[PDB]
Ligand binder design. Structure first.
Ligand code: HEM
Ligand code: HEM
Ligand SMILES: Fc1cccc(C[C@@H]2C[C@H]2NCCc2ccnc(-n3ccnc3)n2)c1
Ligand SMILES: Fc1cccc(C[C@@H]2C[C@H]2NCCc2ccnc(-n3ccnc3)n2)c1
Ligand SMILES: C[C@H](O)[C@H](O)[C@H]1CNc2nc(N)[nH]c(=O)c2N1
Ligand SMILES: C[C@H](O)[C@H](O)[C@H]1CNc2nc(N)[nH]c(=O)c2N1
Ligand SMILES: [Zn+2]
Lengths: 411, 407
């Protein structure tokens, strides 16, 4: 079966065959679409076909499918599975796997870069202190004094589900959030609960508006341990505006390295519960979501007051005006400090080209329109006009429950 | 099978049971989501009639009544007898209002119960259709105080006697292909503007020429009609800061009136059922004006604002986009023509959703369409999970007449 997607602005039509290789369920049925829903211990039984499927993919990609090297590897994995109930990926397989999970991440607009991913193999790590060392090295490598480099660090895979490695932070670098007794919030409201855990675990909080959270690291199913990232490793950018000089006095800054640290990486049936990865920011992540979400820093009003906009009626579009100037500020500040960033116009244009290339070379490109379209100025980006098909391929990045909800405390 | 939707900004969780009633398919499967795809007999008829009458009679606290049973009986006999049936006026109105209520792509549904339904099932000719459409336009326009309306023409019989309005909207601007290679007016309507000429229209080849109506009654060839200019409320677009904005020479019409959809009620098919509401500002300023394949004025505006169009990262497009949408809202409000901004409209829709979940067990909504085409995440609907499914009565797309018309 073939499926066509149309770009309604260019009339370019593409044909998808790749969705046939999809196994995992979407959440949708023939009777209901769940496209806007945010989120709609493994036996040797199911493990070998998952291994085989992956190794089939891997050997095809290296033009060695059906080779003696291919067949020997399958054999070796099978024997290892029934003997040990799991298996170990070769370094080459791991790298392929990590790159392809990124390639398959339908919610990521940055995928044109998928083949350039630095993979750090941390499967020999055994303790939290060891994890901290690997993470520091990742941050330094990825940061690269502002010339950001995509990277992922992969810790040992799940075994029985009782010895999981987990980074308890949602991102490696994030600002603390503090609930005040008067009901207000200081810092990042998104991080209030995690901030409380850190404090409870013995973090001495500065209690400011932009306090970099400590790392909370779990190795081998043990209780997590606190580590402060060396401040010299945390690149931050003061936010100013090219035209408005009062903008700097808002006191805004942001960190340069966006690094997701709470997802699960699945490769060939193996589950890597700690696999922090990092790229670089698309400007709207900070300027629209981090700063302007009502549930985050929520600075729209203060900005709009300082711009002296008509704030009595929404039909003045003061919010839209303030939102644009903030995003201009974010982009300006990063570029001026020579920290890698991409605007949503550039990002989405590149994604369209990536997607077209993927359709031709790969037979498809799974994409989640709801997440790909930027949270401002949607229809003046080419992705808005692009039909997209969403389906799940493996290797993949998946959500997993927050570890504080599942952790068995040792004491 | 009982589904919850979360708002992520408010943590409000709603439980949906209404989707269970859905009958038609979405295009999605367990293995693939098609949420962003724009378009994914006697024995067929009676269960459809039955489903509709059941909900109609349920809605008036008379489910399981003799009148219910009698009506079901009467319709059943009429179908067995005539291979179709006729809706009572009360059912027709109920059906029209509920088709709007069920329109998962319409953000304006909080108004759904206040629809004026014009019954034009007695219409037999294109001149008759023209008259009904003028009356609709005059009524809906209401000198600028817009009122929601639908006019319903006779239902499909054998597919040879279809009533069709050929225009996609009652009121639209012509589009002409220059020899210069470019496009004069609205590029979306080049193909239709040609068919007007092929059938006899005399285009004044301008930029904002109100298109004539092409009306098809009872399967006949369509005829041309000029809507009385006095009935077409238009708004000159000016900005409340930039006095150069007027010289762009932009204007738009006040009445948004979809005329090419199919209304399906109780299995019956109404191929001609133009309806109108009033504009949300972004439909005009973002889509009509700034789409590349439409009037595409972003560059010209940016020039006049003297922005740095050297780099995309100056966000000159975004900046201009906002100003254009300010002008649109300003111009309509200044001329006292009903318009709603995307903030007000989406705020209204969240309230509607909560009402629907409370009083109906759910609200089908297409997030891809409900989230406005600018400033997505600063409107409440962006953070609102939505379930999309098809309920009937419904408005459906249908093929363009000029591909199907047996001339
Ligand atoms: C290199 C530049 C990159 C850019 C510009 C970029 C851009 C983005 C953006 C804008 C999102 C949406 C985030 C949100 O709204 O929550 C996203 C999500 C995502 N990205 Fe990237 N990304 C990049 C690198 C990477 C890398 C290196 C990986 C993995 C190796 C990756 C994997 C993912 C995944 C799995 C998601 C979905 C997260 C979720 O569902 O919560 N991306 N990306
Ligand atoms: C009264 C104020 C109304 C507002 C503010 C409103 C708003 C909107 C908007 C913004 C859209 C998206 C249009 C697009 O992007 O192409 C839409 C679509 C739609 N509306 Fe409304 N509307 C209103 C009235 C109505 C009425 C009176 C009806 C029917 C009786 C209706 C039925 C529909 C349908 C079926 C669609 C989907 C169009 C499509 O799929 O192409 N709406 N509405
Ligand atoms: F399914 C969900 C339920 C609740 C919240 C949510 C928000 C998603 C976590 C946010 N997605 C990651 C955001 C992020 C932060 C930093 N860097 C990056 N990043 C880096 C490379 N690619 C993305 N993404 C989803
Ligand atoms: F599937 C598609 C293929 C090509 C174009 C497309 C756009 C849909 C026509 C636009 N939907 C109606 C737009 C419109 C215009 C005027 N008024 C209203 N309107 C009035 C009340 N509610 C909506 N909608 C879809
Ligand atoms: C309900 C809705 O799915 C949710 O708000 C989504 C919308 N699209 C998004 N798109 C991106 N990139 N990131 C997000 O967090 C979201 N949130
Ligand atoms: C490809 C995508 O489905 C298409 O561009 C949609 C996106 N969302 C939309 N939303 C609305 N309201 N109207 C539209 O025409 C569209 N177009
Ligand atoms: Zn779907």
């Amino acid at each position: 079966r073939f499926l066509k997607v149309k770009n309604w602005e260019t009339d370019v039509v593409l044909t998808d065959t790749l969705h046939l290789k999809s196994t995992l369920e979407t959440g949708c049925t023939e009777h209901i679409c769940m496209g806007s829903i945010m989120l709609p211990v493994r036996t040797k039984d199911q493990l070998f076909p998952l291994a085989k499927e992956f190794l089939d993919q891997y050997y095809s990609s290296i033009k060695r499918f059906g080779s003696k090297a291919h067949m020997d590897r399958l054999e070796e994995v099978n024997k290892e599975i029934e003997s040990t109930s799991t298996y170990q990926l070769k370094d080459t397989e791991l790298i392929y796997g990590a790159k392809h999970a990124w390639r398959n991440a339908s919610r990521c607009v940055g995928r044109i870069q998928w083949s350039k991913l630095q993979v750090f193999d941390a499967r020999d790590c055994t303790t939290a202190h060891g994890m901290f060392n690997y993470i520091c090295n990742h941050v330094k490598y990825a940061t690269n004094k502002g010339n950001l480099r995509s990277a992922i660090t992969i810790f040992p895979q799940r075994t029985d589900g009782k010895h999981d490695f987990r980074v308890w932070n949602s991102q490696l670098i994030r600002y603390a959030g503090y609930k005040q007794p008067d009901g207000s919030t200081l810092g990042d409201p998104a991080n209030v609960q995690f901030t409380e855990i850190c404090i409870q675990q013995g973090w001495k909080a500065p209690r400011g508006r932009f306090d970099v959270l400590p790392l909370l690291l779990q190795a081998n199913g043990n209780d997590p341990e606190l580590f402060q990232i060396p401040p010299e490793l945390v690149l931050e950018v003061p936010i100013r505006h090219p035209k408005f000089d009062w903008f700097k006095d808002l006191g805004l800054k942001w960190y340069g390295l966006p690094a997701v640290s709470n997802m699960l990486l699945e490769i060939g049936g193996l589950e890597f519960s700690a696999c922090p990865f990092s790229g670089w920011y698309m400007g709207t992540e900070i300027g629209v979501r981090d700063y302007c979400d009502n549930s985050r820093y929520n600075i729209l009003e203060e900005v709009a007051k300082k711009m002296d906009l008509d704030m009595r009626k929404t039909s003045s579009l003061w919010k839209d005006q303030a939102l644009v100037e903030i995003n201009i500020a974010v982009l300006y500040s990063f570029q001026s400090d020579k920290v890698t960033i991409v605007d949503h116009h550039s990002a989405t244009e590149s994604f369209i080209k990536h997607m077209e290339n993927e359709y031709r070379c790969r037979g498809g490109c799974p994409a989640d329109w709801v997440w790909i379209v930027p949270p401002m100025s949607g229809s003046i980006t080419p992705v808005f006009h692009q039909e997209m098909l969403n389906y799940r391929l493996t290797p993949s990045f998946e959500y997993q429950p927050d570890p504080w909800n599942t952790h068995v405390w040792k004491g």
